[PDB]
Design a protein around this ligand. Structure first.
Ligand SMILES: Nc1ncnc2c1ncn2[C@@H]1O[C@H](COP(=O)(O)OP(=O)(O)OP(=O)(O)O)[C@@H](O)[C@H]1O
Ligand SMILES: [Zn+2]
Length: 689
RNA sequence: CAAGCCGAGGAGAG
RNA sequence: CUCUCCUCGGCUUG
């Protein structure tokens, strides 16, 4: 309802037209000033007898409900009609109609793009930008190459150039809306010079039709008093040890390579070796040669184990391998449980190579003489704070992978010292259904946030989900364990730690360039402000000229892209799908069908009598509903499916291999859209009637 | 709650 | 340009 002094000046030009960007630091009441500007805009459009509608755009799902509950509704409930949309309600259905009411909309973005392209592609109702008078945005800095709402802004700019060309031609120029982007920092877009950074800023300002940036400069002391930074801090460690376990694994890896007669020309325990392994597997599968592809699939697991060894305990890698080989033995026993039994030489050699050393590795792993350095350093770092703050002790840990989060949470649950000091901990990751891990769900996320704000969990171990959006309580001891993405995540994490005696820690090893990257991002942070100062003081006419040039280039860079996007044959049955582990036939292209033009499936008894089902583990931690399919060899293929009560089994194209009938350039595809040919829709005329 | 499709961005390494 | 990791969004079957 009321404004601050430093918010007043930064908001001021927006109050009379003047589409702009606003970059303030974190936590300066960005949402609140957005709210004031909404209220002023609507009251103004009322006093002039003009229709007024505001739409807010966000990138995530939770920010919509967040802002609907905390900021917009509690202040605007009395004067105006408010609503909040996402893909997690039922209000998505009549989007063209809610616009006819509800002067204040909050929304996830791609709703709007879907409605626009429905208006411009089909005969649906749809909507256009003309039905609005203001678009407020969160997190401007995502406006880049073919992102979510660069699309929208490309259409806005297309219509603006239409209006500008028409100004000289006709009088009736459509009234375009006003645009108010909000952010924390637009961020330099990967540029090695101050000038290229300036260029990137101007590209953003073009893609938002802005007029200025309006950083706070004048009423600055009030900001420093109300708002403060943490202290940057580095904690490095090193190792000159860990021979017994590492070498105990390298021996195995060398044995396998010398069993395969392959030359890596690389090092064990890095990423180039992994890349080599992947391409070797793909080549061996395109050829069909076993004894080299499966050993590659195993060496990948060993390399991953070594990689996590550099950051995590030996026991976690041992558990990884244990789960893997246990699953494999279970697969082989499920296969041989039916009908005579033949064994392979390769898998036999590998299992005999592993299980003989399994107890050895379990003994070597448990050895606190040389556990790891970084873990101990963060032990010191954590215990310092949690002894200092005494029950006002909130916390965040950031890391790279998901599995690291589970391991760290388990570890903190085990070791008594953390529980003694009141270190209640919990993990957190994102919902993408990929990456060989069971993701979490939005509900568990929200619950964890609410427990954090309550204080049931003192510290949150997280992946990069946290270094934006969702509103975590002010913290003290944000750290960074093996992750440096860019300046944006850096500054956003650096904006979390309020509650004085806050920090910003970075934990790395010696022989992995990371502090390098930290310092690079620090300099980029110091550079973008200089560029901002260079452009704020730029001449207006030169600014206008430059943004016009950039808008033109951005619209022409779309058109060129469009031609290649639109430009694809149709072969009904010119392929055969084989198993990828075992060079064995599975299916032809004709047997396959599609449901809802998305899910691929087969419904011939021949394919029904060529696989075995097992029990789901994701649903084991109940009754299984979506079984996991396997081959007679052991390779997982797909997943069950329940369409119209029929238990017709789906499948993937990541686990199979293609053979064309002509000349056998066998290929791997990793997903269905990449290949050119089309499959037919499903119909019950086959198998029935 | 499980399963799958499509699109986008960031980082590394090559 | 490729591989991997991380995140997000929209949409289907159950
Ligand atoms: N003008 C204001 N006067 C008083 N308190 C304010 C004002 N603006 C914001 N706040 C307070 O700040 C809290 C949230 O605002 P804050 O800016 O810290 O988070 P935010 O808006 O999400 O910032 P960011 O999006 O950058 O994290 C609210 O609880 C509110 O009480
Ligand atoms: Zn097989």
């Amino acid at each position: 309802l009321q404004l601050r002094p430093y918010q007043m000046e930064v908001a001021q030009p927006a109050l009379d037209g003047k589409n702009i960007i606003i970059c303030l630091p974190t936590g300066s009441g960005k949402t609140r000033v957005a709210v004031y500007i909404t209220k002023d805009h609507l009251d103004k459009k009322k006093q002039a007898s003009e229709s007024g509608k505001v739409i807010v755009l966000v990138n995530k799902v939770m920010l919509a409900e967040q802002l609907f509950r905390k900021e917009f509704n509690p202040y605007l409930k009395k004067w105006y009609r408010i609503i909040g949309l996402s893909g997690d309600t039922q209000l998505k259905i009549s989007f063209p109609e809610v616009v006819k009411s509800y002067d204040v909309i909050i929304s996830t973005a791609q709703i709007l793009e879907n409605s626009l392209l429905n208006l411009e592609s089909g005969d649906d109702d749809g909507v256009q930008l003309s039905d609005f008078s203001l678009i407020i945005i969160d997190e401007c800095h995502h406006t880049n190459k073919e992102a979510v709402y660069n699309n929208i802004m490309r259409r806005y700019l297309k219509q603006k150039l239409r209006n500008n060309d028409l100004k000289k031609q006709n009088k009736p120029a459509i009234p375009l809306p006003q645009i108010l982007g909000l952010t924390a920092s637009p961020g330099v877009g990967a540029a090695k010079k101050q000038s290229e950074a300036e260029k990137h800023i101007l590209n953003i300002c073009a893609n938002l039709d802005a007029f200025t940036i309006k950083t706070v400069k004048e009423n600055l002391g009030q900001l420093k008093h109300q708002i403060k930074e943490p202290c940057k801090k580095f904690v490095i460690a090193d190792d000159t040890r860990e021979n017994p376990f590492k070498e105990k694994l390298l021996e195995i890896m060398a044995s396998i390579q010398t069993y395969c007669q392959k030359s890596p020309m690389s090092d064990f325990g890095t990423q180039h070796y992994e890349q080599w392994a992947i391409q070797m597997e793909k080549k061996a599968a395109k050829d069909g040669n076993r004894k080299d592809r499966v050993c590659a699939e195993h060496l990948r697991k060993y390399n991953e184990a070594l990689q996590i060894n550099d950051t995590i305990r030996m026991i976690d890698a041992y558990s990884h391998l244990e789960t893997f080989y246990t699953d494999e033995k279970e697969k082989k026993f499920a296969v041989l449980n039916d009908s005579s039994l033949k064994l392979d030489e390769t898998d036999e050699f590998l299992m005999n190579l592993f299980f003989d050393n399994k107890k050895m590795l379990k003994k070597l792993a448990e050895n606190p003489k040389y556990e790891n350095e970084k873990l101990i350093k963060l032990r010191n770092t954590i215990l310092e704070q949690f002894t200092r703050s005494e029950e006002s002790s909130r916390g965040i840990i950031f890391t790279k992978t998901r599995q690291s989060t589970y391991a760290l949470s388990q570890w903190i649950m085990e070791n008594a010292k953390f529980a003694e000091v009141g270190v209640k901990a919990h993990h957190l990751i994102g919902a993408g259904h990929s990456s060989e891990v069971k993701p979490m769900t939005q509900t568990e996320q929200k619950e964890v946030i609410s427990k954090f704000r309550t204080g049931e969990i003192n510290l949150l171990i997280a992946t990069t989900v946290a270094e934006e959006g969702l509103d975590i309580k002010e913290c003290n001891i944000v750290i960074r364990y093996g992750l440096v993405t860019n300046e944006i995540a850096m500054v956003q994490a650096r904006g979390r730690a309020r509650a004085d005696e806050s920090t910003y820690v970075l934990v790395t090893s010696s022989g992995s360039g990371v502090t390098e990257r930290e310092i690079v991002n620090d300099f980029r942070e110091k550079m973008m402000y200089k560029a901002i100062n260079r452009v704020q003081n730029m001449k207006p006419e030169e600014y206008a000229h430059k943004i016009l040039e950039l808008q033109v280039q951005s619209i022409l860079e779309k058109k060129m892209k469009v031609k290649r996007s639109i430009a694809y044959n149709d072969n009904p049955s010119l392929i055969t799908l084989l198993c990828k582990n075992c060079s064995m036939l599975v299916c032809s292209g004709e047997n396959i069908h599609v449901i809802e033009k998305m899910h691929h499936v087969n419904m011939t008894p021949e394919f029904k009598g060529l696989y075995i089902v097992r029990e789901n583990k994701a649903l084991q931690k109940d009754y299984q509903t979506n079984g996991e399919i396997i081959c007679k060899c052991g390779q997982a293929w797909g997943t069950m499916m329940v369409h119209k009560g029929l238990d017709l089994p789906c499948l993937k194209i990541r686990n199979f291999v293609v053979n064309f009938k002509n000349n056998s350039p066998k290929k791997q595809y990793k997903k269905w859209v990449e290949l050119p040919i089309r499959f037919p829709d499903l119909d019950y005329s086959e198998y029935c009637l």
